[PDB]
C-alpha cells in the first residue's frame, strides 16, 4: 500500500496547488524577502492603510475585508474537498456537514502560512498588515485578530510545507466525529487512508522530526478551540453592530454550530 | 530501542495497577455480568444504598445536591491517585517543581474524565470501587442544572469506549496527557516535551502489538484529546453557573477549602 499512499499524497498535493492560488512556498518567498519583484506594501497605521488602497470606520472596513476573503477561502476549500477520493460519493447531507464544520479549522490552518510573528499577508500577497496594527483596532475588533497569530507562531514551528499541508487539510475535512453525520463508517474509512498517507508523508519529508505525526494531530485540539473562541466573538459583534451583515455562505456555516 | 519502549510500557502498566483501586478489566467484569453491585435507579434506592453501602462522604438535604458533592469528593480522591501515578513516570520527578504542579493542575480533569469512561457504559456508572451502580437515566433526571451535568460524561464515555482500549493501553495514554508541554505557565517546556516523545513512541508501539487489526488507532486516540479538552471547558462553564445560581451549596468553610480545586 506504500506506493498507493505515495500516489495518494501526490494526488492531493497536485490538487492543492490547483485549488489555492497563494501557497505557503510563495508566501514564504514574499515574507522572507531578498526579492525586489515580490515585495509587499506594508500597512502599519491609519494613514498607510489609506495609501494601500491607492496602491493595491476603519475597524469595520477591515472586518468586512476579512469576511470577503473568508468567503473566497470557503470556495477554494470546497473545490479542493471535491478532489479528495471518496468525498463526492458520500451522502449529500454529510458532504455539507463535513464542510460546514471543517472550513473554519482549515482557514486558520492555511492563514498561518501567510503569517509571521509581525503580521499577515493580504490581497494574494501584495499587501502585509502588521500584528500590532490589528491588535490596536477599537472595542472588540482588536482582540479578534490576535489569537490567530498566537496559533500561527506555534503551528509554523512545525515547519510544514505545502505537500504536508495538502494531506493534513484533507484529514480535517473527513472527520467522522462531526455533529449530525448520518454515515460515519464511510467517512472514517476515507480518513484512515488519509492518515496513513500523512503518516508516511511526514516520515519521508521530515525523517529527523521525531513524532511529528503525533504533534501535528495534537494541533487539531488548538484549532478546535480557536474556532469556538471566534464564534463567541462573532455573536458579540452581531449584537453590537446591527447595521452590519454577513455573506449567505458564512451565515449558513455558523447556524447551530 | 523497541525493547526499551516495551519496558517503558510495562513500567507504566505496573504502576497504573498499584495507583488505581478499580481497573478497567475489573470494572468491565462487573458491568457486563462476567459479587453483584447495589443498583441506584430512583429516589428510594438511593436512600437505601447510603444506608447499606456506607458512602465515605455522607454528612444539604436535597438529593441532586448530595450526588453532585459526592462527585466532587470522589474527584478529590482521584486527584491524589493521579498525583501518585505521575511520580512513577520516568523523568517526571526530575522536572522543576513548579512545572510538576502546573502539569498536574491542568491534567487531572482530562484524566478524571478518561478514567471515568472505564467505569461507565451506556446505561450507568460504577461507584464505591464497584459496589454500587448508578443508572444513567436516574442521573439524567436530576432537577434544574444537575441533570444536564452528568449526561455529557456518558456521551463522551460511550464514544471513547468504542476504541476498546485496555489498562495497558490506558497506562501510557494517561502519561501522555500529563506531559503536555502546552500548559500555561510552564517554565521549562523542553524536558516535558522530550518525555512525551518517549511516551508517544511507547503508546504507538503498544497499540500496534496489542491491536494489530485496529488501523490508525494511535491517530484516533490522539483525536480524542480534542474531545477531552472541549468537555473540560464545558465542565468549567457548568460549575460557574452552579456556583452562581445555587444558594443551597452550604458547605463547612473547611470543606469548601478542601474542594476549592474542582
Ligand atoms: C450515591 C452517592 C453516595 C451520593 O454517591 C454519588 O452519587 N456519587 C459518588 C460516586 C460517583 C462519582 O463519580 C466519579 C467517579 C470517579 C472514579 O471513581 O474514578 C471519577 C470521577 C467521578 C465523577 N466526577 N464528575 C465530575 O463532575 C468531575 C469530573 Cl468528571 C472531572 C473533574 C472534576 C469533577 C467534579 F469535581 F466536578 F466532580 C462526575 C460527574 C458525573 C458522574 Cl456520573 C461522575 C463523575 C457518582 C456520584
Coordinates of C-alpha atoms and ligand atoms in Angstrom, one line a residue:
Chain A
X1 CA 0.0 0.0 0.0
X2 CA 3.1 2.2 0.4
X3 CA 3.2 3.1 -3.4
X4 CA -0.5 3.8 -3.3
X5 CA -0.1 6.1 -0.3
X6 CA 2.6 8.0 -2.2
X7 CA 0.3 8.2 -5.2
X8 CA -2.5 9.4 -2.9
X9 CA -0.1 12.1 -1.5
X10 CA 1.0 13.3 -5.0
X11 CA -2.7 13.4 -6.0
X12 CA -3.7 15.6 -3.1
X13 CA -0.6 17.9 -3.4
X14 CA -1.3 18.4 -7.1
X15 CA -5.0 19.3 -6.4
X16 CA -4.0 21.7 -3.6
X17 CA -1.8 23.6 -6.0
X18 CA -4.6 23.8 -8.4
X19 CA -7.2 25.0 -5.8
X20 CA -5.3 27.6 -3.8
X21 CA -3.6 30.5 -5.6
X22 CA -1.3 31.5 -2.7
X23 CA 0.8 28.6 -1.4
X24 CA 3.0 28.5 1.7
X25 CA 6.0 28.4 -0.6
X26 CA 5.0 31.6 -2.4
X27 CA 4.0 33.2 0.9
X28 CA 7.5 32.4 2.5
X29 CA 9.3 33.8 -0.5
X30 CA 7.4 37.1 -0.1
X31 CA 7.8 37.1 3.7
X32 CA 11.5 36.4 4.0
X33 CA 12.3 38.7 1.1
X34 CA 15.5 39.3 -0.7
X35 CA 13.4 39.7 -3.8
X36 CA 12.7 43.1 -5.4
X37 CA 9.7 41.8 -7.5
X38 CA 7.6 40.2 -4.8
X39 CA 8.0 43.0 -2.2
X40 CA 4.7 43.8 -0.3
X41 CA 3.4 47.2 0.7
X42 CA 3.2 47.3 4.5
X43 CA 0.1 48.6 6.4
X44 CA 1.0 49.6 10.0
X45 CA -1.3 52.5 10.8
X46 CA -4.3 54.6 9.6
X47 CA -2.6 56.7 7.0
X48 CA -0.7 53.9 5.3
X49 CA -3.9 51.9 5.2
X50 CA -5.4 54.8 3.2
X51 CA -2.3 54.8 0.9
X52 CA -2.6 51.0 0.4
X53 CA -5.9 51.4 -1.4
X54 CA -4.3 53.7 -3.9
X55 CA -1.6 51.1 -4.5
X56 CA -3.2 47.6 -4.3
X57 CA -14.9 53.3 10.3
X58 CA -11.6 51.6 9.9
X59 CA -12.1 48.6 12.2
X60 CA -15.3 47.7 10.3
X61 CA -13.8 48.0 6.8
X62 CA -11.0 45.7 7.9
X63 CA -13.6 43.3 9.3
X64 CA -15.6 43.2 6.1
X65 CA -12.3 42.6 4.2
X66 CA -11.8 39.5 6.4
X67 CA -15.3 38.2 5.8
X68 CA -14.9 38.7 2.0
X69 CA -11.6 36.9 1.9
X70 CA -13.1 34.1 4.1
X71 CA -15.9 33.5 1.5
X72 CA -13.2 33.1 -1.2
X73 CA -11.4 30.7 1.1
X74 CA -14.6 28.6 1.7
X75 CA -15.0 28.5 -2.1
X76 CA -11.4 27.3 -2.6
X77 CA -11.6 24.7 0.2
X78 CA -14.9 23.4 -1.3
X79 CA -13.2 22.9 -4.6
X80 CA -10.3 21.1 -3.0
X81 CA -12.7 18.8 -1.0
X82 CA -14.3 17.5 -4.2
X83 CA -10.9 16.2 -5.3
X84 CA -10.4 14.1 -2.2
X85 CA -11.0 10.5 -3.4
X86 CA -14.4 9.3 -2.0
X87 CA -15.7 12.7 -0.8
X88 CA -18.2 13.3 -3.6
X89 CA -19.5 9.7 -3.3
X90 CA -20.7 10.3 0.2
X91 CA -24.3 11.2 1.1
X92 CA -25.0 14.8 0.3
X93 CA -26.1 15.9 3.8
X94 CA -22.8 14.5 5.1
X95 CA -20.8 16.3 2.4
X96 CA -22.5 19.5 3.6
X97 CA -21.9 18.7 7.3
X98 CA -18.2 17.9 6.8
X99 CA -17.7 21.2 5.0
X100 CA -19.8 23.2 7.5
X101 CA -17.6 22.1 10.4
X102 CA -14.4 21.8 8.5
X103 CA -13.9 25.0 6.6
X104 CA -13.0 27.2 9.7
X105 CA -10.3 24.9 11.1
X106 CA -8.8 24.8 7.6
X107 CA -8.9 28.6 7.2
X108 CA -6.9 29.0 10.4
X109 CA -4.5 26.3 9.3
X110 CA -3.8 28.0 6.0
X111 CA -3.8 31.5 7.4
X112 CA -0.8 30.5 9.4
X113 CA 1.1 30.1 6.1
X114 CA 0.5 33.8 5.4
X115 CA 1.7 34.9 8.9
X116 CA 4.9 35.5 10.8
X117 CA 5.3 36.9 14.3
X118 CA 5.0 40.5 12.9
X119 CA 1.9 40.3 10.6
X120 CA -0.1 38.7 7.8
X121 CA 0.0 38.8 4.0
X122 CA -3.1 40.2 2.3
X123 CA -4.6 40.6 -1.2
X124 CA -2.8 37.5 -2.7
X125 CA 0.5 38.6 -1.1
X126 CA 0.6 42.2 -2.5
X127 CA 0.0 43.6 1.0
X128 CA 1.2 43.0 4.5
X129 CA -0.7 44.1 7.6
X130 CA 1.1 44.2 10.9
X131 CA 0.1 42.4 14.0
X132 CA 0.4 45.5 16.2
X133 CA -1.9 47.5 13.9
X134 CA -4.6 44.7 14.1
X135 CA -4.2 44.4 17.9
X136 CA -4.8 48.1 18.2
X137 CA -8.2 48.3 16.5
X138 CA -11.0 49.6 18.7
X139 CA -13.5 47.9 21.1
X140 CA -13.9 44.1 20.3
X141 CA -12.1 44.0 16.9
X142 CA -8.6 44.4 18.3
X143 CA -9.0 41.1 20.2
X144 CA -10.3 39.4 17.0
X145 CA -7.1 39.0 15.1
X146 CA -4.6 38.2 17.9
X147 CA -5.5 34.5 18.8
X148 CA -4.9 33.7 15.1
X149 CA -1.3 35.0 15.4
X150 CA -0.8 33.1 18.6
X151 CA -1.7 29.8 17.0
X152 CA 0.3 30.5 13.8
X153 CA 3.6 31.2 15.6
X154 CA 3.3 27.8 17.3
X155 CA 2.0 26.0 14.3
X156 CA 4.6 27.3 11.9
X157 CA 7.4 26.0 14.2
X158 CA 6.4 22.5 12.9
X159 CA 7.9 23.7 9.5
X160 CA 5.3 22.0 7.4
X161 CA 5.4 22.6 3.7
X162 CA 2.6 22.5 1.2
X163 CA 2.8 18.8 0.3
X164 CA 2.3 18.0 4.1
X165 CA -0.5 20.5 4.4
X166 CA -2.4 19.1 1.5
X167 CA -2.8 15.8 3.3
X168 CA -3.5 17.4 6.7
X169 CA -6.3 19.6 5.3
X170 CA -7.9 16.5 3.8
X171 CA -7.7 14.7 7.2
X172 CA -9.5 17.6 8.8
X173 CA -12.4 17.6 6.3
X174 CA -13.0 13.8 6.7
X175 CA -13.6 13.9 10.4
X176 CA -16.2 11.2 11.4
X177 CA -16.9 12.9 14.8
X178 CA -18.7 15.9 13.4
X179 CA -22.2 16.6 14.7
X180 CA -25.1 15.2 12.7
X181 CA -23.3 12.8 10.4
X182 CA -25.5 10.1 9.0
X183 CA -22.9 7.6 7.8
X184 CA -19.8 7.7 10.0
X185 CA -18.3 4.5 8.7
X186 CA -17.5 5.5 5.0
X187 CA -16.1 8.8 6.3
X188 CA -13.7 7.1 8.7
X189 CA -12.6 4.6 6.1
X190 CA -11.6 7.6 3.9
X191 CA -9.8 9.2 6.9
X192 CA -7.8 6.1 7.7
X193 CA -6.4 6.2 4.2
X194 CA -5.6 9.9 4.5
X195 CA -4.0 9.4 8.0
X196 CA -1.9 6.5 6.6
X197 CA -0.8 8.9 3.8
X198 CA 0.0 11.7 6.2
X199 CA 2.0 9.4 8.5
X200 CA 4.1 8.2 5.6
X201 CA 4.5 11.7 4.1
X202 CA 5.7 13.2 7.4
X203 CA 8.2 10.3 7.8
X204 CA 9.8 10.7 4.4
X205 CA 9.8 14.6 4.3
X206 CA 10.8 15.1 7.9
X207 CA 12.8 12.0 8.9
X208 CA 14.6 13.9 11.7
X209 CA 11.4 15.4 13.1
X210 CA 10.5 12.8 15.8
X211 CA 6.8 12.1 16.3
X212 CA 5.8 14.9 14.0
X213 CA 2.7 12.9 13.1
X214 CA 1.5 12.8 16.7
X215 CA 2.5 16.5 17.2
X216 CA 0.5 17.6 14.1
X217 CA -2.6 15.7 15.3
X218 CA -2.4 17.4 18.7
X219 CA -2.7 20.8 16.8
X220 CA -6.3 19.8 15.8
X221 CA -7.0 20.5 19.5
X222 CA -5.7 24.0 19.3
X223 CA -7.7 24.6 16.0
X224 CA -11.0 23.4 17.6
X225 CA -10.5 25.9 20.5
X226 CA -9.8 28.9 18.3
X227 CA -12.9 28.2 16.2
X228 CA -15.1 28.2 19.3
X229 CA -13.5 31.4 20.6
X230 CA -14.0 33.0 17.2
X231 CA -17.7 32.1 17.0
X232 CA -18.2 33.6 20.5
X233 CA -16.7 36.8 19.3
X234 CA -19.0 36.9 16.2
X235 CA -22.0 36.5 18.4
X236 CA -21.0 39.7 20.3
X237 CA -20.4 41.7 17.2
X238 CA -23.7 40.6 15.6
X239 CA -25.5 42.0 18.7
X240 CA -23.5 45.3 18.9
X241 CA -23.3 46.3 15.2
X242 CA -26.9 45.8 14.0
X243 CA -26.2 47.7 10.7
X244 CA -23.7 45.1 9.5
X245 CA -24.3 41.9 7.5
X246 CA -22.8 38.5 6.7
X247 CA -22.4 36.7 3.4
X248 CA -25.0 34.0 3.0
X249 CA -22.3 31.3 2.9
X250 CA -20.9 32.4 6.3
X251 CA -24.4 32.9 7.7
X252 CA -25.2 29.2 6.9
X253 CA -21.9 27.8 8.2
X254 CA -22.4 29.3 11.7
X255 CA -26.1 28.3 12.1
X256 CA -26.3 25.9 15.1
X257 CA -22.6 25.2 15.2
Chain B
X1 CA 15.1 0.7 21.3
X2 CA 12.0 -1.4 20.6
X3 CA 12.8 -3.4 23.8
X4 CA 13.1 -0.1 25.7
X5 CA 9.6 1.0 24.6
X6 CA 8.2 -2.3 25.8
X7 CA 10.0 -1.8 29.1
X8 CA 8.5 1.7 29.5
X9 CA 5.0 0.4 28.7
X10 CA 5.3 -2.4 31.3
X11 CA 6.7 0.0 33.9
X12 CA 3.7 2.3 33.4
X13 CA 1.2 -0.6 33.5
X14 CA 2.7 -2.0 36.7
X15 CA 2.4 1.5 38.3
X16 CA -1.1 2.1 37.0
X17 CA -2.2 -1.1 38.7
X18 CA -0.8 0.0 42.1
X19 CA -2.2 3.5 41.9
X20 CA -5.8 3.0 40.9
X21 CA -8.1 0.8 43.0
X22 CA -10.5 -0.3 40.3
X23 CA -9.1 -1.3 37.0
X24 CA -10.9 -1.2 33.6
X25 CA -10.7 -5.0 33.4
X26 CA -12.3 -5.4 36.8
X27 CA -15.0 -2.8 36.1
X28 CA -15.9 -4.4 32.7
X29 CA -16.3 -7.7 34.5
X30 CA -18.9 -6.1 36.8
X31 CA -20.7 -4.1 34.2
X32 CA -21.3 -7.0 31.7
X33 CA -22.2 -9.6 34.3
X34 CA -19.0 -11.7 33.9
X35 CA -20.5 -10.4 43.8
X36 CA -23.1 -8.1 42.4
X37 CA -23.4 -4.3 42.9
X38 CA -26.1 -2.3 44.6
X39 CA -28.2 -0.5 42.0
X40 CA -29.4 3.1 42.3
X41 CA -32.2 3.7 39.8
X42 CA -34.6 6.1 41.6
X43 CA -35.0 8.2 44.7
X44 CA -35.8 5.3 47.1
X45 CA -32.9 3.0 46.0
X46 CA -30.6 6.0 46.6
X47 CA -31.7 6.3 50.2
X48 CA -31.2 2.5 50.8
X49 CA -27.7 2.5 49.2
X50 CA -26.3 5.1 51.5
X51 CA -27.7 3.1 54.5
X52 CA -26.2 -0.1 53.0
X53 CA -23.1 0.8 51.0
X54 CA -21.8 3.3 53.7
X55 CA -20.6 6.1 51.4
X56 CA -17.4 7.7 52.8
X57 CA -18.9 11.2 52.3
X58 CA -22.3 11.4 53.9
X59 CA -22.6 14.3 56.3
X60 CA -27.8 20.0 52.3
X61 CA -30.9 17.8 52.5
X62 CA -31.5 17.8 48.7
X63 CA -30.9 14.8 46.6
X64 CA -29.4 16.3 43.4
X65 CA -27.0 18.4 45.5
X66 CA -25.7 15.4 47.6
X67 CA -25.0 13.5 44.4
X68 CA -23.1 16.5 43.0
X69 CA -21.0 16.9 46.1
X70 CA -20.4 13.1 46.0
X71 CA -18.9 13.6 42.5
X72 CA -16.6 16.3 44.0
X73 CA -15.4 14.1 46.9
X74 CA -14.5 11.3 44.5
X75 CA -12.6 13.6 42.2
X76 CA -10.5 14.9 45.1
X77 CA -9.7 11.3 45.9
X78 CA -8.8 10.6 42.2
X79 CA -6.5 13.7 42.1
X80 CA -4.4 12.1 44.7
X81 CA -4.3 8.8 42.9
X82 CA -3.2 10.5 39.7
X83 CA -0.6 12.5 41.5
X84 CA 1.0 9.3 42.9
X85 CA 1.0 7.7 39.4
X86 CA 2.6 10.7 37.8
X87 CA 5.6 10.3 40.2
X88 CA 6.3 7.0 38.6
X89 CA 6.5 8.4 35.0
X90 CA 10.3 8.3 34.1
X91 CA 11.6 11.8 34.2
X92 CA 8.6 13.5 35.9
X93 CA 10.1 13.9 39.4
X94 CA 13.2 15.4 37.9
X95 CA 11.3 18.3 36.4
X96 CA 11.2 21.8 38.0
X97 CA 8.8 21.6 41.0
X98 CA 6.5 24.4 39.8
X99 CA 6.2 22.6 36.4
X100 CA 5.2 19.4 38.1
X101 CA 2.5 21.4 40.0
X102 CA 1.4 23.0 36.7
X103 CA 1.2 19.8 34.7
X104 CA -0.9 18.1 37.4
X105 CA -3.2 21.1 37.9
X106 CA -4.2 21.2 34.2
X107 CA -4.1 17.5 33.5
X108 CA -6.2 16.0 36.3
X109 CA -9.5 17.0 34.7
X110 CA -8.7 15.3 31.4
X111 CA -7.5 12.2 33.2
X112 CA -10.5 12.0 35.5
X113 CA -12.9 12.0 32.5
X114 CA -10.8 9.5 30.6
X115 CA -10.7 7.1 33.5
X116 CA -14.4 7.6 34.4
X117 CA -15.2 6.1 31.0
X118 CA -13.7 2.9 32.2
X119 CA -16.5 2.8 34.9
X120 CA -19.3 3.6 32.5
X121 CA -21.4 2.1 29.9
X122 CA -24.4 3.5 28.0
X123 CA -26.7 2.6 31.0
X124 CA -24.8 3.8 34.0
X125 CA -21.7 4.3 36.1
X126 CA -20.0 2.2 38.8
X127 CA -19.4 3.8 42.2
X128 CA -17.6 2.9 45.5
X129 CA -14.9 0.7 43.8
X130 CA -17.7 -1.1 42.0
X131 CA -20.0 -1.9 45.0
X132 CA -22.7 0.4 43.6
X133 CA -24.1 1.2 40.1
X134 CA -26.0 4.4 39.4
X135 CA -28.2 4.3 36.3
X136 CA -27.7 6.9 33.6
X137 CA -31.5 7.6 33.5
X138 CA -31.6 8.4 37.2
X139 CA -28.7 10.8 36.8
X140 CA -30.2 12.3 33.6
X141 CA -33.4 13.0 35.5
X142 CA -32.0 15.1 38.3
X143 CA -33.6 18.6 38.6
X144 CA -32.6 22.1 37.3
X145 CA -28.9 22.2 36.2
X146 CA -27.8 18.9 37.8
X147 CA -29.5 16.5 35.3
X148 CA -27.6 18.0 32.3
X149 CA -24.3 18.0 34.3
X150 CA -24.0 14.2 34.4
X151 CA -25.1 13.3 30.8
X152 CA -22.2 14.8 28.8
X153 CA -19.8 12.5 30.6
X154 CA -21.8 9.4 29.5
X155 CA -21.9 10.8 25.9
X156 CA -18.1 11.1 25.9
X157 CA -17.6 7.7 27.6
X158 CA -19.8 5.9 25.0
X159 CA -17.7 7.2 22.1
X160 CA -14.3 6.8 23.9
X161 CA -15.0 3.2 25.0
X162 CA -15.8 2.2 21.3
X163 CA -12.0 2.3 20.9
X164 CA -11.9 -0.8 23.2
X165 CA -8.7 0.2 25.0
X166 CA -7.4 -1.9 27.9
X167 CA -5.5 -0.9 31.0
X168 CA -2.0 -1.4 29.5
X169 CA -3.1 1.0 26.6
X170 CA -4.6 3.5 29.2
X171 CA -1.5 3.5 31.4
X172 CA 0.6 5.0 28.6
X173 CA -2.2 7.3 27.3
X174 CA -2.7 8.8 30.8
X175 CA 1.1 9.5 30.9
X176 CA 0.9 11.3 27.5
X177 CA -1.8 13.6 28.9
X178 CA 0.2 14.6 32.0
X179 CA 3.3 15.6 29.9
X180 CA 1.6 18.2 27.8
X181 CA 4.1 20.9 27.1
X182 CA 1.4 23.4 26.1
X183 CA 0.1 24.1 29.6
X184 CA 0.0 27.8 30.6
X185 CA 2.9 28.9 32.9
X186 CA 5.4 26.2 32.2
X187 CA 8.9 27.3 32.9
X188 CA 10.9 24.7 31.0
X189 CA 8.9 23.1 28.2
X190 CA 11.9 21.2 26.6
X191 CA 12.2 18.3 29.1
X192 CA 8.4 17.9 29.3
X193 CA 8.1 17.5 25.5
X194 CA 11.1 15.2 25.4
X195 CA 9.4 12.8 27.9
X196 CA 6.2 13.0 25.9
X197 CA 8.0 12.0 22.7
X198 CA 9.2 8.8 24.6
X199 CA 5.7 8.2 25.8
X200 CA 4.1 8.7 22.4
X201 CA 6.7 6.2 20.9
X202 CA 5.6 3.7 23.6
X203 CA 1.9 4.3 23.0
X204 CA 2.3 3.9 19.3
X205 CA 4.1 0.5 19.6
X206 CA 1.7 -0.7 22.3
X207 CA -1.3 -0.1 20.1
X208 CA 0.2 -1.9 17.1
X209 CA 1.1 -5.0 19.1
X210 CA -2.0 -5.1 21.2
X211 CA -4.4 -4.1 18.4
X212 CA -2.7 -5.2 15.2
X213 CA -6.0 -5.1 13.3
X214 CA -7.2 -1.6 14.5
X215 CA -5.8 0.6 11.8
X216 CA -4.7 4.1 12.8
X217 CA -5.9 3.5 16.4
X218 CA -3.0 5.7 17.5
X219 CA -4.2 8.6 15.3
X220 CA -7.8 8.0 16.5
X221 CA -6.8 8.0 20.2
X222 CA -5.0 11.3 19.8
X223 CA -8.0 12.8 18.1
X224 CA -9.9 12.1 21.3
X225 CA -7.7 14.5 23.1
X226 CA -9.7 17.1 21.2
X227 CA -12.9 15.8 22.7
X228 CA -11.4 15.8 26.2
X229 CA -10.2 19.4 26.1
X230 CA -13.6 20.5 24.9
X231 CA -15.6 18.7 27.5
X232 CA -13.3 20.0 30.3
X233 CA -14.0 23.5 29.0
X234 CA -17.8 23.0 29.1
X235 CA -17.5 21.4 32.5
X236 CA -15.8 24.5 34.0
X237 CA -18.6 26.6 32.4
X238 CA -21.2 24.5 34.1
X239 CA -19.6 24.7 37.6
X240 CA -19.5 28.6 37.4
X241 CA -23.3 28.5 36.6
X242 CA -24.0 26.2 39.6
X243 CA -21.8 28.4 41.9
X244 CA -23.8 31.5 40.8
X245 CA -27.4 30.0 40.8
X246 CA -27.3 27.7 43.9
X247 CA -27.5 29.4 47.2
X248 CA -28.0 26.0 48.8
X249 CA -24.4 24.7 48.4
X250 CA -23.8 25.2 52.1
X251 CA -20.5 23.6 53.0
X252 CA -18.4 24.0 56.1
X253 CA -15.7 26.6 55.2
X254 CA -13.1 23.8 55.8
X255 CA -14.9 21.6 53.3
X256 CA -15.1 24.5 50.7
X257 CA -11.4 24.8 51.2
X258 CA -10.7 21.1 50.6
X259 CA -12.8 21.2 47.3
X260 CA -11.6 24.6 46.0
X261 CA -9.8 22.9 43.2
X262 CA -12.8 21.3 41.5
Ligands
LIG1 C1 -24.7 7.8 45.8 C2 -23.7 8.7 46.5 C3 -23.1 8.1 47.7 C4 -24.4 10.0 46.9 O1 -22.6 9.0 45.5 C5 -22.8 9.6 44.3 O2 -23.9 9.9 43.9 N1 -21.6 9.7 43.6 C6 -20.3 9.3 44.1 C7 -19.6 8.3 43.2 C8 -19.6 8.8 41.7 C9 -18.5 9.8 41.4 O3 -18.2 9.6 40.0 C10 -16.9 9.7 39.7 C11 -16.1 8.6 40.0 C12 -14.7 8.6 39.6 C13 -13.9 7.4 39.9 O4 -14.4 6.5 40.7 O5 -12.7 7.3 39.4 C14 -14.2 9.7 39.0 C15 -15.0 10.8 38.7 C16 -16.3 10.8 39.0 C17 -17.1 12.0 38.6 N2 -16.6 13.2 38.5 N3 -17.5 14.0 38.0 C18 -17.3 15.4 37.8 O6 -18.3 16.1 37.7 C19 -15.9 15.9 37.7 C20 -15.1 15.4 36.6 CL1 -15.7 14.2 35.5 C21 -13.8 15.8 36.5 C22 -13.2 16.7 37.4 C23 -14.0 17.2 38.4 C24 -15.3 16.8 38.6 C25 -16.1 17.4 39.7 F1 -15.3 17.8 40.7 F2 -16.9 18.4 39.4 F3 -16.9 16.5 40.3 C26 -18.7 13.3 37.6 C27 -19.9 13.7 37.0 C28 -20.8 12.8 36.8 C29 -20.6 11.5 37.1 CL2 -21.9 10.3 36.8 C30 -19.4 11.0 37.8 C31 -18.4 12.0 38.0 C32 -21.0 9.2 41.3 C33 -21.6 10.3 42.3

